[PDB]
Design a protein around this ligand. Sequence first.
Ligand SMILES: Nc1ncnc2c1ncn2[C@@H]1O[C@H](COP(=O)(O)OP(=O)(O)O)[C@@H](O)[C@H]1O
Lengths: 339, 937, 64
Amino acid sequence: SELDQLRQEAEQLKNQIRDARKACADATLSQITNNIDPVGRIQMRTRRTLRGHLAKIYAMHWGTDSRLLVSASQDGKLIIWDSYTTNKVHAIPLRSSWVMTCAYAPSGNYVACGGLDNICSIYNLKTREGNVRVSRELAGHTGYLSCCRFLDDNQIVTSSGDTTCALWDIETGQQTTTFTGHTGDVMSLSLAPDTRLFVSGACDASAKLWDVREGMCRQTFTGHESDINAICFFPNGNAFATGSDDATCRLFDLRADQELMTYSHDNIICGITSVSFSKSGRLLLAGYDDFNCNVWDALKADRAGVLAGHDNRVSCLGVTDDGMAVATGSWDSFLKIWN
Amino acid sequence: LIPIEFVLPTSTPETALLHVAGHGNVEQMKAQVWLRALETSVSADFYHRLGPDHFLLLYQKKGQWYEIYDKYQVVQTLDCLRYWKVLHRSPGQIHVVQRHAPSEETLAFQRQLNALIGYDVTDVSNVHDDELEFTRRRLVTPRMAEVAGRDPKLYAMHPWVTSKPLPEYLLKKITNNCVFIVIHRSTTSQTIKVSADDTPGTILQSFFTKMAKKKSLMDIPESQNERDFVLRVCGRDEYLVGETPIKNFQWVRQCLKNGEEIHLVLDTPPDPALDEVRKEEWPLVGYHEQLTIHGKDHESVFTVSLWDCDRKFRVKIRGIDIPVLPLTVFVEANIQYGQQVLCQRRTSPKPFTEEVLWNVWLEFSIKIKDLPKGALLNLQIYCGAQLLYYVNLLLIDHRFLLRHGEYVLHMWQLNADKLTSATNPDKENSMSISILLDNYCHPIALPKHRPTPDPEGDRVRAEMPNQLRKQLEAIIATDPLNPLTAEDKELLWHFRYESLKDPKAYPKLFSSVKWGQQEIVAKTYQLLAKREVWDQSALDVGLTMQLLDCNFSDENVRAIAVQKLESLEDDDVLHYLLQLVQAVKFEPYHDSALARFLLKRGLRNKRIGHFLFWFLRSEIAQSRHYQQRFAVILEAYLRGCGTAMLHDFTQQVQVIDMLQKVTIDIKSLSQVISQLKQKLENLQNLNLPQSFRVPYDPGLKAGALVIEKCKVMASKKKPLWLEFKCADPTALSNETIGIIFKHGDDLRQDMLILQILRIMESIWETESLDLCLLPYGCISTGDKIGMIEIVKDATTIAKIEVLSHWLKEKCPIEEKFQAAVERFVYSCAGYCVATFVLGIGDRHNDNIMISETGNLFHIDFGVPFVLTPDFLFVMFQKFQDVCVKAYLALRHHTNLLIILFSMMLMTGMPEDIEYIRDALTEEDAKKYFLDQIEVCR
Amino acid sequence: NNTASIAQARKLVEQLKMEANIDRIKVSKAAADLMAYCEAHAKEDPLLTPVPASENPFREKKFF
Ligand SMILES: Nc1ncnc2c1ncn2[C@@H]1O[C@H](COP(=O)(O)OP(=O)(O)O)[C@@H](O)[C@H]1O
């Protein structure tokens, strides 16, 4: 009675959402974008190689200076690199070897990391003694720390294996907000340029837009046939792309609350590990589990180029805030800069 | 306090009401009663003469006379009080009865048993604890229960039933679902044909009904009913009764496979009592909250939980002392857990005198609160580096308490040995070590973990990301000889419920857990409290073997492994008995669940009892390091079986010894033959009995020795080629039970290797092939002394293209001839494929023997293999097809082959484990295997 | 186990009500907006349009 009536109300509101989305689906991005000049072939060259990690690299994140970058690795170390000079600005050994994520703070003073340990260890690079000292152990998550991004020097969002995300205030060591609702492990997230919104991708083959201010899911996007491994915002902040283990990427617009474009090719069979937009967003750089990192024209949906510079899975990648270079860390223990 | 009514022995037996402190100690209570008695006694003289030791406190629990053995048990914990309170008994009654010294019957019985075992069970001259005697007292109850529930008739007859379904090549042998049975009665023969799927009882009822009227002609008394007969193989004592398909008996299937006829003879039901069991009179022998100081007043403190002590473990050495002078020396202690090194501590080099003193305290980084149940202080005396001695000591004793005081231990001198927990018996020329463990005003107990729900796994139930799942499963897919790197250990430990439902990972899961911590162990116990998938899993016997292996010492992991073994049927138990034995070596304690498993299987089968008896006797005589443990189990066993088994063991042991003496004496140097025959006639004069079930055959009795058929060979050891004669007049033929008795060559190898091959074929037969191998039974009896069976009509291949001429000639007909040709091929390829896996295929022809009937067997287990040209000439398509189907069939149980090859290579023989894999190597493996076959060609 | 199933289905339906109560925008305008965004920042996106080697810090110079 109460549960069957509430289940049929759920399953009516769902088709009301599908119809509210189909209504706006008047034309595709492929139709409107047929005319624009194709991007051509993005011939990219390996500018740098970052040696020093002994095993798989699990994460990396550029600093806002577009020159420094953190990197987490299976060998249990958290290294800070100077991309321009290749020198290791810091080689921090970690308490847990199973680090999975890292995030250079936009301020550059703090860096955060975490992993299977179920703790988000926040480190201060500018320490009282100039050492690499641990500022905080943000504990409370009941699962492995899967990803995190600094809002400021005192606030940081982290996702975990409890199927939830959470905003923390570094000083209080307390979960400011808790983002519940997902039905699967949350693999990734992405802060909007406006720190009030962020999206998150999960293994149930759906993504969800959260309001940092309040902590509610604003929209939920589907379409992937498998887990979402990576997610990021379109530079403007009104759209975002998702990579999935279904060997396809997809674009979703928040205002249209539906998929705009699909990026895939029959040759590609392995899942997507990472994605990033160019400063303008015209280029989508997708990392794959075939040692490749394909460059797509986001508007034409055409595979503009291919980056094949790694010997193992291209696990992670990022783009500088100035779009000057692309970093790609991989299981080969080496990151590679591209231009 | 509580009121208890104690019954004195003084006349009616005086009884008085007393009170005992609710939190007292057994002994005190004794004194309490002693004084009141001494004061109220009508004749206190009797109590004055004696003391409290002479009497024992017995209480009847529902008619069962229980004794309060341990003298330090908590008075409240006494089950008697709980039983009374549930019964509302007030005041409770306990009786006081003197210690009546033994009688003679019992001492003679004990002497008999000790003669059987080869070691005294009451020897206490090489012991530092009372562990052995308490094990002996404890084992009584399971044995009494196991004996209480069983059938006399079935056990005495011990049907060798089976429950596997027939292989292909044997189903055809049954035409129209029927088989031909020869029936003997007197010398009257009656051939009948009965369906292969009819149980023997129905067969006997039918045999009665068919010929009931002419029963006199068959020479059966007419007064007997159907109840008076059962079938019995002619020439054996292997009865055929019960409710089992007549196709499910290993002898029927052997007769079919080899192809002989089925001969059976009617027999009478052996009586139940003859297996009577010697009566026995040995009477019927917490949580962290209660065992911790915190939360309690110092006035009422009685014990300290081991987990409250944060002090780093510390041990004081005093010195070493060798009476005999054999440089720098130095002790090097190390805590170890199942070959895992927890912590170490060495000491400075010192001058090497016959006695060297240190009087130094070593401290271990591990904390007294972080000791697992069954760590093992290993103490070594290196030399300069070459190790010279070693010794080990349990840090928690057998009753959940820590070790405290001064201990002097004797040193074994240099495996399952280096993990030995016994003191050297040689107290005259052995290096001695003296150490001190600091005392404590109260016992250092160790509570029992309590099961608590673990939400870390309960609500963590959504499928993990496909990448992490891929990594997990890819890790689990390697062989157990793949060492788990720290990374993998951490990954698996976090994912400690993704693997809970995958049995094929359980000996990689528990190879990550870090026992040196308390939280880890508590969470492991929580994990193992939820084991639904494991419980109702597939009863594999390569997995439950890596659970009973060396690397593990827990009390619950082995518990679940044995709970899986609880289901096996008889034949399998018997298949892997040898290895179960080599496995009890690795135990941490004497009283375990593996030992009780072996004991409980031994008491409901006779073949199991026989094989267990001989294996344990061999190991006792051969392996002193654990001989006390083996002996305790073996004696706890021998008191359960029947009198007939005792008599049979006695006669068997008599014959083995007598021959021992004769043999060695001979090996001292027609002269030898004549002296041997004189000594054998003396043996007949020494009453060498003619009724002893041959050790490797519970049904095959030997008889009076045929003196002229014996001899001494010209080989190295020159064993005796005895030829006994059957001892049952209903033998279908007049063939001689042949044996060979060799001394000076290790006979542990041939035993294990034969179990290996015997399983290799049990796998092949599980795969509906038949390679026709000949596992002749061998059993070892002492150090470099072992009886071997004889393969009738055998010859040496080195002694003999001419091979096929020899064969042809031997075979008078081309039909039998080609039957032999199939045998020679099937069996020459089988043996090849099966020696190549083990890495011992390289052998000179001196160790290969061909049987006239077509079979080919190897001997003397001390190029891929031997595939000499003669083998090819005697043979080619079928050879290859069989070779491939074999190798492919074997590689489907590599986990088990490698487990065995290892669980043995350590306990037995003196990188070595790698070969098995280089050669184990689907299509690519076939190509390699055939490159190995065609290259030897 | 209805109070849990009901509290969950209620969270579900309040979420779907949240998501459905948004004024979506025609896809055509979403595209036009994104296209004109790239058109605007195509000059300011060196990954899209190759920049001079001198302006690239990685190639031209080793000192920074
Ligand atoms: N089951 C058996 N049946 C017949 N003969 C056997 C059996 N087992 C061993 N032999 C004989 O024993 C001899 C080998 O004895 P052994 O002492 O092992 O030789 P070596 O000392 O050269 O290794 C062979 O000649 C073989 O005929």
